[PDB]
Amino acid sequence: SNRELVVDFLSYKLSQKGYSWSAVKQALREAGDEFELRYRRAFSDLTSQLHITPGTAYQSFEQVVNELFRDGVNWGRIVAFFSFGGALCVESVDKEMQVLVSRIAAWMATYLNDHLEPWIQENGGWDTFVELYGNN
């Protein structure tokens, strides 16, 4: 379910770059698109400077995401989390490490389930996310 959201979002982002991986989902896709628009107006894509490899990808994922949520959680930072995952996947497919896509997806799902789920449930669940971000 969280895992399902993750795979849908990543597949959407991959398709936008011409790559292919074969209400909540729609809200998240749109939120991701808006997040990325805002990001590009402010900061350069630093994804490349991470040097993603199979041996280092989890550690880069884990360290960024831990730092993202260190000060706290909100729906906007959760959108950032999904967009970041998307960026890691696009870079991965770009550089012919497409097997990392399924690993990043799993890492994201596990992080959601183990670490963001308590906050999500405390703040109305994904239903509240749809109320706030739906049709946008």
Binding site: A31, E34, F35, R38, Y39, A42, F43, L46, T47, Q49, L50, H51, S60, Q63, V64, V65, N66, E67, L68, D71, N74, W75, G76, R77, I78, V79, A80, F81, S83, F84, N123, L132, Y133
Partner: peptide, 28 residues
Amino acid sequence: ESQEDIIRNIARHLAQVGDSMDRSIPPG
């Protein structure tokens, strides 16, 4: 230039744009 510097920058950028996208209203 460091890996950890890159990490910290990305997370900071994500966090700031994330907060600009926070649509929640505090409870009344």
